[PDB]
Design an enzyme around this catalytic site. Structure first.
Site, PDB file in Angstrom:
ATOM      1  N   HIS B  41       0.820  -1.218   0.000  1.00 25.78           N
ATOM      2  CA  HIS B  41       0.000   0.000   0.000  1.00 25.78           C
ATOM      3  C   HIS B  41       0.848   1.261   0.000  1.00 25.78           C
ATOM      4  CE1 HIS B  41       0.148   1.013   4.317  1.00 25.78           C
ATOM      5  NE2 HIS B  41      -0.231  -0.206   4.655  1.00 25.78           N
ATOM      6  N   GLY B 143       2.364   5.756   9.991  1.00 28.60           N
ATOM      7  CA  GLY B 143       3.785   5.737   9.680  1.00 28.60           C
ATOM      8  C   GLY B 143       4.508   4.513  10.215  1.00 28.60           C
ATOM      9  N   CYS B 145       3.664   1.425   9.577  1.00 29.57           N
ATOM     10  CA  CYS B 145       3.576   0.294   8.624  1.00 29.57           C
ATOM     11  C   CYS B 145       4.935  -0.174   8.188  1.00 29.57           C
ATOM     12  CB  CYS B 145       2.727   0.705   7.440  1.00 29.57           C
ATOM     13  SG  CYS B 145       1.119   1.325   7.919  1.00 29.57           S
TER      14      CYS B 145
END
Ligand code: XI0
Ligand code: XI0
Ligand code: BR
Ligand code: BR
Ligand code: CL
Ligand code: CL
Ligand code: CL
Ligand code: NA
Lengths: 305, 306
Positions: B41, B143, B145
């Site tokens: 993503h 942030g 991820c």
């Protein structure tokens, strides 16, 4: 979202852990530049521990009586001395992985991360607080002596604790890295005990702010209190007194949430007097006191090292 | 003595964290050898997240649309491919700090350490369990991820989780390092939600054994139970069924304490009925389920405090 008991990343400290053996005792040491620091009781036999004269016991040792191993490499000891309850072994090789560091002595209520070590090898990391009675509720077994506590700020490791002993209640005692004990404990096998402990009030307030940041607000109410009235309740429930310095240190969390510290004190006063009425806060049925105000700000804002 | 949520030392994983930026999105990646792994993503905008076609979004990118930074060094991307929900960026420089590692997909109830990172830099380390509903109760902000979960039993890092999202209840979901989600979750902004969670029974029993090893027996009783009667009761409190595999994995703790597994089950049935009556167990007022039998053996003494 979420709120966990989070430790600092331990990599900078892992590269400093070594094994120190003297006679039949093996424990951990911290290797910074060309010195290895460890508990001075490494020089004692069990009989010496009953009434040790450390100056005389150390005079009888030579450099070759200390075997220091960094992984598979033997570091040769070229000098030895004591600073308070810490033995300093000068070695012939400087640690190439020495981080930027300081030795700092902390106060009760402050938290730090522990890198638990056995045979010079790091085993685990956890966060804890220095209790008001100067003990720590660690998790340590025989052989863990010399494991250290630290905090990080940017790229600097501040070492604050070196582990020396376990007390009869299963809590732990140790020194700063200059070898000064925290609490009224000695490195001798004599009757010693943890004193009566108290709850770190400023930290419980910090954790109630963390709960509000995370959406848990059921304990908020219309009331406020005074610092004097709150302190009379704190004394009754064996909580540490809250000072104006604590109110000031809670300033950033109070500003972030919009909740005045004395407004949050009225919530804590009601929780102490009434309990939680079957409810939890941040998943806990107990009031948590091992997060400082700075720990909550760090975690909730994503501060990195 | 003592008993804490103990994470693995994080150094071997810290040396693998990098920052990955594509367009306006920056997240973390894991750099092992000459590959950087990160959530796919990273190529999406917020509007793309409603109904992304990842094949169509990715074909429009070149290698130089990915910026990868390891500390103060830019790594040059020389290839890219997607494997399930993970993007693999081939870089021209291998990580010289790559530890011995493997990828493992874990089962619900297993624990691991998480190194939470932002902008490729570590913030902190903590223990998590994979819940029975395939979520984790982490502490992650926007942030985070690309932060990973791992174990380091025996000097090899076993990577088991990569963080991708936060669900509406504030719990977290992600994938294994082959990019397959744990649970039914997708990397698309849908109405997906965490299912009703249950308590990890085998872990609660392991933690009661830790309490006995550390010197406390107040919660034991004179009874035993069959496994089926224990499960009929436990399920009424939203506890997971205990299987014979779970009874086998508790074997070493039972041997060390002299308490048969079904006799510790009888103790747990009574604690669910009675609560603790003002007492605590290993410092907790609630029954703890995020320590496995292996985690108890890892941390506790091999000698019971009788
Ligand atoms: C289970 C455990 C966990 N943590 C550390 C220890 C170590 C311990 O307590 N020691 C070692 C020497 C004898 C004893 C002692 C006694 C008195 C003063 C000191 Cl400094 C040390 C044990
Ligand atoms: C607070 C926080 C904590 N952890 C991670 C996140 C990231 C997150 O949830 N994202 C990022 C893109 C939109 C959204 C998302 C939505 C749906 C599916 C996926 Cl994979 C991702 C946020
Ligand atoms: Br597993
Ligand atoms: Br609790
Ligand atoms: Cl020891
Ligand atoms: Cl009220
Ligand atoms: Cl993100
Ligand atoms: Na109030």
């Amino acid at each position: 979202s979420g709120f966990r008991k989070m430790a600092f990343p331990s990599g900078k400290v892992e590269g400093c852990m070594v094994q120190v053996t003297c006679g039949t005792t093996t424990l951990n040491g911290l290797w910074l530049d060309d010195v290895v620091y460890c508990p001075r009781h490494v020089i004692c036999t069990s009989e010496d521990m009953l009434n040790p004269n450390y100056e005389d016991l150390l005079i009888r040792k030579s450099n070759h009586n200390f075997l220091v191993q960094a992984g598979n490499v033997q570091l040769r000891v070229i000098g030895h001395s004591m600073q308070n309850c810490v033995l300093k072994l000068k070695v012939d090789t400087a640690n190439p992985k020495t981080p930027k560091y300081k030795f700092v002595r902390i106060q009760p209520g402050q938290t730090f991360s522990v890198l638990a070590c056995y045979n010079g090898s790091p085993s685990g990391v956890y966060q804890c607080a220095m209790r008001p009675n100067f003990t720590i509720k660690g998790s340590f077994l025989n052989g863990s002596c010399g494991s250290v506590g630290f905090n990080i700020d940017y790229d600097c490791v501040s070492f604050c604790y070196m582990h020396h002993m376990e007390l009869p209640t299963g809590v732990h005692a140790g020194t700063d890295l200059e070898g000064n004990f925290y609490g009224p404990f000695v490195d001798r096998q004599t009757a010693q005990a943890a004193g009566t402990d108290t709850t770190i009030t400023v930290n419980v307030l910090a954790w109630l702010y963390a709960a509000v940041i995370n959406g848990d607000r059921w304990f908020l109410n219309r009331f406020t209190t005074t610092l004097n009235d709150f302190n009379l309740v704190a004394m009754k429930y064996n909580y540490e007194p809250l000072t104006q310095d604590h109110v000031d240190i809670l300033g950033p969390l109070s500003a972030q949430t919009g909740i005045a510290v004395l407004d949050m004190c009225a919530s804590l006063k009601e929780l102490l007097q009434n309990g939680m009425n079957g409810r939890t806060i941040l998943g806990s049925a107990l009031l948590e006191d091992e997060f400082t105000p700075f720990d909550v700000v760090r975690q909730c804002s994503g501060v990195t090292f």
